[PDB]
Design an enzyme around this catalytic site. Structure first.
Site, PDB file in Angstrom:
ATOM      1  N   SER A   1     -36.446   9.258 -14.178  1.00 10.05           N
ATOM      2  CA  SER A   1     -35.665   8.386 -13.320  1.00 10.05           C
ATOM      3  C   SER A   1     -35.295   9.202 -12.090  1.00 10.05           C
ATOM      4  O   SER A   1     -34.638  10.233 -12.203  1.00 10.05           O
ATOM      5  CB  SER A   1     -34.408   7.927 -14.055  1.00 10.05           C
ATOM      6  OG  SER A   1     -33.521   7.273 -13.168  1.00 10.05           O
ATOM      7  N   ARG A   2     -35.718   8.759 -10.914  1.00  9.09           N
ATOM      8  CA  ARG A   2     -35.535   9.558  -9.696  1.00  9.09           C
ATOM      9  C   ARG A   2     -34.159   9.450  -9.047  1.00  9.09           C
ATOM     10  O   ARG A   2     -33.789  10.322  -8.256  1.00  9.09           O
ATOM     11  CB  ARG A   2     -36.588   9.203  -8.652  1.00  9.09           C
ATOM     12  CG  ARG A   2     -38.024   9.373  -9.118  1.00  9.09           C
ATOM     13  CD  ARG A   2     -39.001   8.914  -8.050  1.00  9.09           C
ATOM     14  NE  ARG A   2     -40.368   8.902  -8.558  1.00  9.09           N
ATOM     15  CZ  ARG A   2     -41.449   8.847  -7.791  1.00  9.09           C
ATOM     16  NH1 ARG A   2     -41.323   8.802  -6.469  1.00  9.09           N
ATOM     17  NH2 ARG A   2     -42.652   8.844  -8.349  1.00  9.09           N
TER      18      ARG A   2
END
Ligand SMILES: Nc1ncnc2c1ncn2[C@@H]1O[C@H](COP(=O)(O)OP(=O)(O)NP(=O)(O)O)[C@@H](O)[C@H]1O
Ligand SMILES: Nc1ncnc2c1ncn2[C@@H]1O[C@H](COP(=O)(O)OP(=O)(O)NP(=O)(O)O)[C@@H](O)[C@H]1O
Ligand SMILES: [Mg+2]
Ligand SMILES: [Mg+2]
Lengths: 483, 468, 482
Positions: free
Chosen positions: A350-351
């Site tokens: 998850s960025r």
């Protein structure tokens, strides 16, 4: 016959009708044929218009009249669609009558620009131990669910929707998250059955279904995600929050390919048109978290992609990965072993979500990210030496792997989650067998609820771990394990 | 009587010109009278200038530009009802058994809409099949689709026939068998075998309707036959309310036909050379096989895998619609196990707590678990001798061998070929029977008591007759 | 005129685009000024697309073209036996006109579902490997498939040669008439084939239908269907014809030429969407007719050449799935001296046993097995192996060797079964591997001088009784000792 407002069919085949007249028509205006079937003015040419049909070609003949509509392709929007099941054009398919529209939005709406956005910081709680701890999703994010056939992709999104029941029953409108589920290319029965599941868990009253199923016309499948985003967008633009699942984009892309090849557009890589990336990118750009000035709403996207033979390097997978803010990759190998959710942590990320994670989880997730997907270093090598040091990480690794398992339809509250992870990370499971880690977890939560409920409540209400609550949690953990 | 004129003949593509807006709808069946008998065309496109493009259902040699062409006013229609049972029928609903007209009173179009979203049954549910391996380990979904795998020499035809029979007696539902690209030689076999087995009974009452689209017919014909077979199956559901079996042999030949029609129609091919409409072509067939409130058509579809590549766009698209697989293996056959179903290979979406209940699931998962180490233990028992087994291991392996044989079963249809009486075991027995064996309540029974028997009471009955 | 005639609009590449001819049938034959023929494959609004049977240097724009009123037909009848014809049935062997029973069309409805009976009577090829492991029955379509130069024609050819055993008799129900289709081959190759048949006295029951490499594409395209109808005269009249289509790879190439030049849409490997239909249309015509319909049969050996052994290629795919099984040939085996180079584990006959002499089925039962178990343990053939494996290896080597056979030497069934029996049962174990050949030869001649009774029974009864088996056992050991 006004040839300004009206047209005559010249020819029909391959999902296109060629139409003469309609001189006042707009590009991408919806039209109506005699049979009541609808179309979209795709290419306006000298002396004719090319109309893409939203149904079978049977429903249009040569010589027939076509009426202008006035309207660029659009749909009903508003809180009145809640609890409703519709087709890609917004038409109810659930037996329940006319939709109650606050108004109409175009299918194709431009994305929020550079300015009206703010970084995601509000959690989207999935209730899945592995996702919340290791791939935290924030309100406004886009996170791809990707993997092979039958690997739990839909399950992951559906647990997320079922989980919202937690806040959508409260009053505080900001904590609420309305849900738009888009079925593109799926079987009618899958979707019917899905809706009944939602009804049974009482999730349906805060969710909207948009279905363009397997036997429907390629353009209806192409279109569905776009009309579902405007439905989703209403919440976004009105200071509320909506989650949109695109199940799945692989099938949207396939439908788009059908349309392009029949339109005689040049096949590129894997036979997809050049614009198959723009297909997804424009769609997904519409997910966002908005600024104070824009009312602080958010649309969060969970697109689903289906790999073949587990190859994330194919054209369509890599296209979507180059759009979304991360991936939850599901391995078929883990899935067959019984490890479900089969989240391959090595390949999941998850960025932007880390910000939006609930602190409690963040605190007991100390390096869990690093460690776990690295126990994978030892694990792969293991089956050359009966080592001392690296025999420990093989025993902890194995434990956290079971802790991450989770039954379907059973999303869990944060305060139910953090103890299980605390109890894993600090090695209180090291002594307990594998076959009992399942039973341990159910029995441990019972213990916590009855005897140490004061503490769960504190985790829930402040979302942090004060040194005292951290120490108190150590206390209750040791006790249960011993017996 | 709306008439047109042939204006072009290019192989199996025939163009016909008509009078103003007297034009046949796309998917209408057209007819030319030939000295052969009559040639059916199906309207494919409106080309403009009162000309439509069509696909031939039979040969077009001999056609002449200007020849009259009659509009039927609708899609290819097929007879439906009980007067189709025991008969052989082609793509256009004609009898091809030299047995006279199908004295059916009704006819229905082969092209039709699927049950509406609202018409859709809302809970998945098992179709009990009377067959141990299947019911226990990979149960069929009611109104689902099932992939039947493994080619020939594995008793596919006996397995299909047992199904036709078990369903008709246990649920009073009929069957329709659709040979999509069927090899004439093999169709002729099947027919003779069905008579021999009883499932067709020319002097009595038949349980199955045969529809054949032979390989020597033009793609148009091969693409549509499935829908022919399916229409007949839908009538039994929608009007008679039955739970109906539809067999499609072979589903890949449906795909290839549409690939070929698409190519003749000028359409630019997609990935791997399949038609750009691969998925919708598939959907237009599959979505019609489902459970309504009235009944279900459930379909057993034989699945070929090109190059044994499971990511090939044809299987890949098919698999999307499959609820279960029955995997027939010579490796199961060459151990004398009938039906030759592979218990580890064959898989179902419905083997699930929520669908079959907690009993059923638990029993099957253990059987699966048991057979699984026994498979890996084939490796050490071949080298270390038998004696080298641990306490729980040397038992479960003696009890696996016992389970593996209990998965056999005599087929009532095999009876004529075997003389052994046939057994339709109810799912109810099947669950307990296996739960008990797993618990060790029959360890002191020699293996042969378990081979080719129905429910537990026959393991009991058998072992008492082996005693003397 | 225009209803019965036409003007050449354009010509080029064997395509003549023609104005008029408004009453012509699809697939009808035309005649040009200069005398070149062709057939009308494309009927279009403006024009007619005609494919030419001869050099298009003979056709010009403006030229007059007449209907003949006929779809392509071909003479058929016994009067073709021993003859060599082009694809239209013209004699090309300098032996005079061909007398015809009547005329059949190139394209004929294959027998329906109902007028057939299960394949049961054998086509005895004479080839040990085939007759023992991949048996073919009258009516069956069995594919002979492999890379170039692997012996494919040879399999077909030894089969045709083997039919002398009944084709010299008087019992028409046992005779097998032979039709050989040379599609795309060179003429000297067809010439040498003919000579071979002539030398072995097999031309008398064979018909060669030749559309060689220099001949216009339509004729190569037509030749198979045309040969088929020639075959069908036998089938329709209570007899049995065998048709070899050597080969269908080349026929698919010819049809692709026509289609690309008629500008029909191309697909995979540039084939037209009706290339599957071409071959299935063609191959379903081989059939075993019902008793009502005369019991006639036509049995087909289509040939397909693969490239690099890729059976997933477009044309092999089509043909593998149309037919009833594969005889698979391989260079590898070939170079090892295993000839015919049949890959047992890749060859099949879905019909199977139903088409095998019972005697051969009795002795071969296990052959299927040992060889199966052989090629599984093969990589072991390279010291320490238990007496179990040493045995398995000993056996298989010898059974493999027994399946080698010289070209042009097909064996009678009664010659095959005792050879197979000796091996199958271990009478060859103690015999050094290089001597299995001379063993076969000697053993056969020994059985012929001393045991003509056993051979006569095998041949005349088709089964082996326990008395025959016991007799066979004795006579074998007798010889092996000696
Ligand atoms: N967390 C879980 N625990 C146990 N079983 C699960 C879990 N999630 C899913 N399953 C089951 O596994 C199967 C596959 O899950 P599903 O969510 O349908 O994946 P999918 O990738 O969407 N498959 P499909 O879309 O049909 O190709 C379903 O039958 C689920 O019931
Ligand atoms: N049983 C056999 N023993 C020894 N040599 C053989 C045998 N069969 C064939 N050959 C030789 O091997 C070569 C190939 O055989 P042939 O029948 O020409 O195969 P093919 O596959 O038709 N080759 P081509 O048509 O030229 O691609 C020829 O020179 C044969 O004479
Ligand atoms: Mg899914
Ligand atoms: Mg050759």
């Amino acid at each position: 016959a006004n040839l300004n407002e009206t047209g005559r069919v010249l020819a029909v085949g391959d999902g296109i009708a060629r139409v003469f007249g309609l001189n006042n028509i707009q590009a991408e205006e919806l039209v109506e044929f005699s049979s009541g079937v609808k179309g979209m003015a795709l290419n306006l040419e000298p002396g004719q218009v090319g109309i893409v049909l939203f149904g079978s070609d049977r429903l249009v003949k040569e010589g027939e009249l076509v009426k202008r509509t006035g309207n660029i392709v659009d749909v009903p929007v508003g809180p009145g669609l809640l609890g409703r099941v519709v087709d890609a054009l917004g038409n109810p398919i659930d037996g329940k009558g006319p939709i109650d529209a606050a108004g109409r939005s175009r299918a194709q709406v431009k994305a929020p620009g550079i300015l009206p956005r703010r970084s995601v910081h509000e959690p989207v709680q999935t209730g899945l131990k592995a996702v919340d701890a290791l791939v935290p999703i924030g309100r406004g994010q886009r996170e791809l669910i990707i993997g092979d056939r039958q690997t739990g992709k839909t399950a992951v999104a559906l647990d997320t929707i079922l989980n919202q029941k937690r806040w959508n029953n409260g009053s505080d409108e900001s904590k609420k998250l309305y849900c738009v589920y888009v079925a593109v290319g799926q079987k009618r029965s899958t979707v019917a059955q899905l809706v009944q599941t939602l009804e049974q868990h009482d999730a349906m009253k805060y969710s909207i279904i948009v279905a363009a199923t397997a036997s429907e016309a390629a353009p209806l499948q192409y279109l569905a995600p776009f009309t579902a985003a405007s439905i989703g967008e209403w919440f976004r633009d009105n200071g509320k929050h909506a989650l949109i699942v695109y199940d799945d984009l692989s099938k949207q892309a396939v439908a788009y390919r059908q349309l392009s090849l029949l339109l005689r557009r040049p096949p590129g890589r894997e036979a997809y048109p050049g614009d198959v990336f723009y297909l997804h990118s424009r769609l997904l750009e519409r997910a966002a978290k908005l600024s104070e000035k824009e009312g602080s709403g958010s649309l969060t996207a969970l697109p689903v992609i289906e790999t073949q033979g587990g190859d994330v390097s194919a054209y369509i997978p890599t296209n979507v990965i180059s759009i979304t803010d991360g991936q939850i990759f599901l391995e078929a190998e883990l899935f067959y072993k019984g490890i479900r959710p089969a989240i391959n942590v090595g390949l999941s990320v998850s960025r932007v979500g880390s910000a939006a994670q609930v602190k409690a989880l963040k605190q007991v997730a100390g390096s869990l990210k690093l460690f776990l997907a690295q126990y994978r270093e030892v694990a792969a090598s293991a089956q050359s030496d009966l080592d001392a040091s690296t025999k420990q990480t093989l025993v902890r690794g194995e434990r956290l792997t079971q802790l991450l398992k989770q039954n379907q339809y059973s999303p869990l509250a944060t305060e139910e989650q953090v103890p299980l992870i605390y109890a894993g990370v600090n090695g209180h499971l090291d002594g307990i067998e594998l076959s009992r880690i399942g039973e341990f977890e159910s029995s441990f939560l019972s213990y916590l609820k009855s005897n140490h409920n004061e503490l769960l409540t504190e985790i829930r209400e402040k979302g942090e771990l004060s040194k005292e609550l951290l120490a108190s949690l150590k206390s209750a953990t040791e006790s249960f394990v011993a017996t | 009587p709306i008439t047109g004129k042939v204006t072009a003949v290019i192989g199996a593509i025939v163009d016909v010109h008509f009078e103003q807006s007297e034009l046949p709808a796309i998917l209408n069946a057209l007819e030319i009278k030939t000295p052969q008998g009559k040639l059916v065309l199906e309207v494919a496109q409106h080309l403009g200038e009162n000309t439509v493009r069509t696909i031939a259902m039979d040969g077009t040699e001999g056609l002449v530009r200007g020849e009259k062409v009659l509009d039927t006013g609708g899609p290819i229609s097929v007879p439906v009802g009980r007067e189709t049972l025991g008969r052989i029928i082609n793509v256009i609903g004609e009898p091809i058994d030299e047995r006279g007209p199908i004295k059916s009173k009704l006819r229905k179009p082969i092209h039709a809409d699927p049950p509406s979203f609202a018409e859709q049954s809302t809970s998945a549910e098992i179709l009990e099949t009377g067959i141990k391996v299947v019911d226990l380990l990979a149960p069929y979904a009611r109104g689902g689709k099932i992939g039947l795998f493994g080619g020939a020499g594995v008793g596919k035809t006996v397995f299909i026939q047992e199904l036709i029979n078990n369903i008709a007696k246990a649920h009073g539902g009929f069957s329709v068998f659709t040979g999509v690209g069927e090899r004439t030689r093999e169709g002729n076999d099947l027919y003779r075998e069905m008579k021999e087995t009883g499932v067709i009974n020319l002097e009595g009452e038949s349980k199955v309707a045969l529809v054949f689209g032979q390989m020597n017919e033009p793609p148009g014909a091969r693409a549509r036959v499935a829908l022919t077979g399916l229409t007949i199956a839908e009538y039994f559901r929608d009007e008679e309310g039955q739970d109906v079996l539809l067999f499609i042999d072979n589903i890949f030949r449906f795909t290839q036909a549409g690939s070929e029609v698409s190519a003749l129609l000028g359409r630019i091919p997609s990935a791997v050379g399949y038609q750009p409409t691969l998925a919708t072509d598939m959907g237009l067939l599959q979505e019609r096989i489902t459970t309504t409130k009235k009944g279900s058509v459930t379909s057993v579809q034989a699945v070929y895998v090109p190059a044994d590549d499971l990511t090939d766009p044809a299987p890949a698209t098919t698999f999307a619609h499959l609820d279960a697989t029955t995997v027939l293996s010579r490796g199961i056959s060459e151990l004398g196990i009938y039906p030759a179903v592979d218990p580890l290979d064959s898989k179902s979406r419905l083997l699930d707590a929520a669908v079959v209940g907690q009993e059923h699931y638990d029993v099957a998962s253990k059987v699966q678990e048991t057979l699984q180490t026994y498979k890996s233990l084939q490796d050490i028992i071949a080298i270390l001798g038998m004696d080298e087994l641990s306490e729980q291991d040397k038992l479960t392996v003696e009890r696996a061998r016992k389970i593996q044989r209990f998965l056999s079963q005599p087929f009532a249809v095999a009876e004529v070929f075997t003389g052994i009486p046939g057994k339709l075991v109810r799912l109810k027995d099947t669950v307990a029977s296996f739960k008990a064996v797993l618990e060790g309540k029959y360890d002191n029974i020699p293996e042969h008591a378990f081979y080719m028997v129905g429910g537990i009471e026959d393991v009991v009955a058998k072992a008492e007759k082996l005693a003397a």
